[PDB]
Design a protein around this ligand. Structure first.
Ligand SMILES: CC[C@H](CO)NC(=O)Nc1ccc(Cl)cc1
Ligand SMILES: CC[C@H](CO)NC(=O)Nc1ccc(Cl)cc1
Length: 460
């Protein structure tokens, strides 16, 4: 039985509005409704992994697991295994996988983050799950961010708290937050960004939705505008939105958007918005293709409609050679040549690098670089040809060219990371000096750049 080099992953996000679901929710898992929808000819083909995020979920874990498993069994005639379930208040994540994957899945982690302080602490935050699928690390975040059209900055703050404090994946990757720990990271939820148009334009907006004319609405979507201004979700992807706003509906129909201010809303308008989103971030040059992104039309118990997204994701096999794991493979080496970091910091400490990768027995600390002043004010940290030669555990190019090196630049004075990035070893050539590049971030914000050349020796 061969190990896969691709899997498909279903992501669902649904703010259930504190109401039980209807008896049939299969359209959700079949990616049927509005938007980029899945071909009918695929209906019986199970996804490999289903990750379900809910918000305002009124059910017990047991109640929801029974609905989800019986839903998938009806679609696929497969009895899915529960990988993980984690709930914070009424925010929940469920991961289900095909039984054939049970022995491929390991290192399962769960965590949650509560956002806000005092007043603003007590119902918003995030849950997440990570695990290994053979040689590939997968992370999943379901967040329910702060509500209200005039709170986009709070949402952006909630995002930074979640990526700083959610403790998933390999704890040995200590300089790295969740935005660097996984081959593939999926972040979804009721992100609660709104269409920023005047209240007076409500009926115009509804008109546009009925005509399926989303362009003039998407141009005011706060998540797209905040992302374009690099205020949030830096280096994440989202598929193009081609489905109607998923909030705020009158319950038991989808014919009516309920936007007017009410005591129940705190006297806030809820103009039609794309609150419910799926984004991802994968390591450079790893296959990831969105094959659906849309909303259901026939599940009407909530004031939100469910959102689905599906992905092809590249995965790698556990690799065993005669040599590694358990030793180095002397026919392998990674040389980082003529490298320099460009940092936005005003500090004047010396800096060193750390190289982290599951292709190394343990992380590697460099010597301190040489600081110079850039022409436009910047700090440039030069490493020259001084960087330690990295000794991978396995030299076989079928393994090594699929790996990645995480880089942290740390202060000698404080040992704190000033920037984190990632370099793919999927090179155009071996035994050849080739340009490399990564942006550097810290707490998910841009802090600089790392560039230089690499020379990779494999056994071929
Ligand atoms: C039982 C010991 C560990 C740690 O709790 N759990 C585990 O491996 N769970 C699991 C793996 C694969 C799949 Cl498909 C479903 C569940
Ligand atoms: C894929 C990386 C390239 C490099 O420039 N561009 C990019 O990501 N552009 C972009 C991001 C967010 C939004 Cl909202 C609109 C455009």
């Amino acid at each position: 039985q061969p190990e896969p080099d691709m899997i498909t992953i279903f992501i669902g996000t649904w703010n259930m509005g504190n109401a039980p679901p209807p008896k049939k929710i299969t359209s959700w898992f079949l990616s049927k409704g509005q938007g980029k929808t899945r071909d009918d000819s695929a209906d019986y083909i199970p996804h490999d992994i289903y990750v379900i995020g809910t918000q305002e979920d009124p059910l017990s874990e047991k109640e929801w697991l029974e609905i989800l498993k019986h839903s998938l069994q009806e679609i696929t005639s497969v009895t899915f295994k529960t990988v993980a379930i984690h709930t914070l208040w009424n925010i929940r994540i469920v991961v289900l996988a095909k039984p054939e994957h049970e022995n491929r899945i390991s290192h399962i982690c769960t965590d949650n983050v509560k956002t806000g302080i005092a007043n603003t602490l007590g119902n918003k935050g995030a849950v997440g799950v990570s695990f290994m699928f053979n040689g590939t690390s997968l992370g999943f975040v379901n967040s329910h961010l702060t509500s209200g059209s005039e709170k986009k900055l709070r949402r952006n703050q909630n995002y930074m708290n979640i990526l700083r404090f959610l403790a998933l994946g390999d704890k040995k990757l200590s300089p790295f937050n969740i935005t660097h720990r996984f081959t593939h990271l999926f972040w979804f939820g009721d992100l609660n960004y709104r269409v920023d148009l005047p209240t007076w334009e409500a009926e115009t907006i509804i008109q546009k939705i009925k005509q399926q004319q989303y362009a003039d609405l998407l141009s005011h979507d706060q998540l797209l505008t905040e992302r374009r201004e690099q205020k949030v979700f830096l280096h994440f992807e989202e598929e193009e939105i081609t489905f109607a706003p998923t909030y705020r509906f009158e319950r038991l129909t989808r014919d009516k958007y309920a936007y007017t201010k009410q005591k129940a809303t705190g006297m806030k308008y809820n103009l039609p918005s794309w609150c419910d989103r799926v984004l991802w971030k994968s390591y450079p040059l790893v296959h990831v293709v969105c094959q659906s992104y849309g909303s259901t039309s026939d599940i009407m118990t909530s004031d939100h409609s469910p959102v689905f997204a599906t992905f092809e994701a590249g995965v790698t096999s556990q690799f065993v050679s005669k040599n590694g794991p358990g030793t180095v493979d002397s026919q392998g080496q990674i040389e980082f040549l003529r490298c320099y970091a460009t940092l936005k910091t005003k500090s004047q400490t010396k800096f060193y690098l750390e190289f982290h990768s599951s292709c190394l027995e343990s992380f590697v600390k460099s010597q301190e670089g040489e600081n110079e002043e850039g022409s436009e004010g910047e700090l440039v940290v030069k490493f020259g040809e001084t960087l330690p030669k990295l000794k991978p555990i396995i030299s076989d190019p079928e393994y090594l060219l699929d790996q990645h090196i995480l880089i942290s630049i740390k202060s000698s004075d404080s040992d704190e990371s000033y920037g984190e990035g990632c370099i793919a070893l999927r090179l155009e050539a071996t035994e050849t000096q080739l340009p490399i590049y990564t942006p550097l971030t810290h707490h998910g914000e841009l802090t600089g750049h790392f560039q230089g050349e690499i020379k990779l020796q494999t056994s071929q």
